[PDB]
Design a protein around this ligand. Sequence first.
Ligand SMILES: CNC(=O)[C@@H](c1ccc(Cl)cc1)N1CCC[C@H]1C(=O)O
Ligand SMILES: CNC(=O)[C@@H](c1ccc(Cl)cc1)N1CCC[C@H]1C(=O)O
Length: 339
Amino acid sequence: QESVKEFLAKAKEEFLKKWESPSQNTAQLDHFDRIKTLGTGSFGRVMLVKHKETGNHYAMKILDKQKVVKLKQIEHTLNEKRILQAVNFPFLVKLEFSFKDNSNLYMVMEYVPGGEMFSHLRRIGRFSEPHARFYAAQIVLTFEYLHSLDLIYRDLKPENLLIDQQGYIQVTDFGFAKRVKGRTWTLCGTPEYLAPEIILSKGYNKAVDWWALGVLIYEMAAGYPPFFADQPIQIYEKIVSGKVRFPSHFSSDLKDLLRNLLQVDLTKRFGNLKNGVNDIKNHKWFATTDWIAIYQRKVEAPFIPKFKGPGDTSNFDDYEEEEIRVSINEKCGKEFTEF
Ligand SMILES: CNC(=O)[C@@H](c1ccc(Cl)cc1)N1CCC[C@H]1C(=O)O
Ligand SMILES: CNC(=O)[C@@H](c1ccc(Cl)cc1)N1CCC[C@H]1C(=O)O
């Protein structure tokens, strides 16, 4: 519909203006109080912080420049920040400030206190199909938006989907997102969610996101991912076979959608055909979905996370609390000039 085409054209105009002229250096570390570590990774951490003047809470991603360099994530970290400062969509966590210092890169994101979908899914076991569908619809729209901007997300998994105060998803972690007009080649993503063409070291495209949506929908509705095995090599063999077994409790419509998203041949995969995202949005499994009402956040969510306020960390887990040290000398200044 022309209304959708015009919405996406405007979205792309607005993205490109920020993409071409990225914001930089919009806060500094001593404007915030450190509260709690919300998560950790190979080269950084996410910390709940409070802005000392406004009292607002944020999730501050802190990346150690020297570890970014050593783990070959320079371009990925520059992609992440340049993309996040340029996008704007209801189901993406917003980047509020970014800056760097002698030791670290900082991305100060809105704080979503409801926690990761991962925790909620593991606690309940599996989501009903309507509940999985409510979240899936948000991802479909988010990927429609991102792909229209030539962006591939490349890290869809339940840990990266935060549940907000209204029960809606906010996607976090753009560490593997990239602007790609054709193909790209980097091996990245978590094993259970990788498309076959990534495992096989091919040049791949936005169809890997639609594969990962199939994995996410399966895992939401089953409670476990479709290619589960004990070690990555075994997961990869299952993925490239694409042999999927569906629980008998799945509806026929869900199984049909998943066979088309978990299509090993990327040239036959839903989301990657002539009709693009509309093969997904028009599939029978989504027949009850009001796409506009989802976008406008007018659908009552399947559940509302329990939390006490914008500073509550009870839905995140506990980590050893380590210093945020800032060296007296600048590290890796050249590599991160554009950040
Ligand atoms: C203001 N909203 C729209 O123009 C779109 C929309 C929203 C987001 C995206 Cl990424 C694409 C399209 N509405 C209108 C009709 C279809 C429906 C939809 O959400 O599919
Ligand atoms: C995006 N938010 C997070 O917290 C991320 C994270 C942590 C550190 C960094 Cl540098 C980047 C990303 N992790 C990784 C998977 C689960 C989660 C955690 O540990 O809770």
